[PDB]
């Protein structure tokens, strides 16, 4: 239903919040990496916005993001959680029980986000491109990309987003 938005908003605030706490991020802190074009391939009703919450410590960031994501997921009801494993496999190719999720995610993140491909990126303006997202006819889905300020930080944010968008495929029949 429309709680999917309730959730993405909870996440967006919890993320924006922990970065500020666990990493001294702020709306007015220099940004190494800036977001360029942020769009979706198959956009069936998702309005996108980018927010800056930059800080210098990429690892403090990555930890805050995983943290928020874990807190948020832990807030879902047993009934809701059950749909997550499917999203996972759909957006990443990874089996997972309703428990091993949190862990499996962390592993995926840690690996991916530390890849040379990622950490070695010295390209200042980076484009975020998800590929599918849906929104109800009445109300569209609002997605916000929180720019951590680092290639490694945004890598986590992006992975999170890829999952989120795969959950919007469930609201729209």
């Amino acid at each position, epitope marked *: 239903a429309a709680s999917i938005q309730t959730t993405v908003n909870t996440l967006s605030e919890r993320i924006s919040s922990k970065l500020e706490q666990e990493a001294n991020a702020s709306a*007015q802190t220099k940004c190494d990496i800036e977001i360029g074009n942020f769009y979706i391939r198959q956009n069936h009703g998702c309005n996108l916005t980018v927010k800056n919450m930059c800080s*210098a410590d990429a690892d403090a960031q990555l930890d805050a993001v995983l943290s928020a994501a874990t807190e948020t997921y832990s807030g879902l009801t047993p009934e809701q959680k059950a749909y997550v494993p499917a999203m996972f496999t759909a957006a990443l190719n990874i089996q997972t029980s309703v428990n091993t999720v949190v862990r499996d995610f962390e592993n995926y993140v840690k690996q991916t986000c530390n890849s040379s491909a990622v950490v070695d990126n010295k390209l200042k303006i980076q484009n975020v491109i998800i590929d599918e997202c849906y929104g109800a006819p009445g109300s569209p889905t609002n997605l916000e990309f929180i720019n951590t300020g680092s290639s490694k930080g945004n890598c986590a944010i992006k992975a999170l987003m890829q999952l989120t968008t795969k959950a919007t495929t469930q609201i729209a029949p």
Partner: antibody
Amino acid sequence: QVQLQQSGAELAKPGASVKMSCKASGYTFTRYWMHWVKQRPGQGLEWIGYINPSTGYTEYNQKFKDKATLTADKSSSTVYMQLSSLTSEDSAVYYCARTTVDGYDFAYWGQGTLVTVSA
Amino acid sequence: DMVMSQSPSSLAVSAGEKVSMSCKSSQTLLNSRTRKNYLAWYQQKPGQSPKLLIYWASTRESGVPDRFTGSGSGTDFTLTISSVQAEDLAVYYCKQSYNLWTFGGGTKLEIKR
């Protein structure tokens, strides 16, 4: 207290290279950006480039792009700046500075490292 | 690209008197949205390292006496020392942090005696 210890003075032959250091302590190394600045005897300050200790991300002044190279060792909490193909024009004192929280201004400075390029 | 012009190059003043120097950029350092001016002032006393005095166009850095005042906006800024003292002898540099970083040529402050 916050403190930045830069290496000692240096004398190099023209065409040679040199590599200075800045040892940081008294704050989380990975929480602030580190900038470098040049100053020829009797002249003003000049921005060279900066580096993010945590990610190794760097950006230089177009003017120094091929002369200076910034690196950082998180395990030792020290930042290195290396100058190549030296010339009399490179003779000056170099400073490392830790930024403020927002990363825009230089809150703390090293004592500087004087480099002399002469045969 | 970006060019910082300070003026005058140097000025003499006696202790007690007041002074003002100018810093002008070839580009605006103001962020319309936030109202922030990405410009700071640095003091460098003979034989020493540069010290941060004012950041954000007018905010005093911790421990800096209030006789130092940062003003201006957009592309015209002024540093003002209410009542200079011998110890204030130094060269003052203004630096922009909007589009990368740039220092002015500085204004050498001399003391009349």
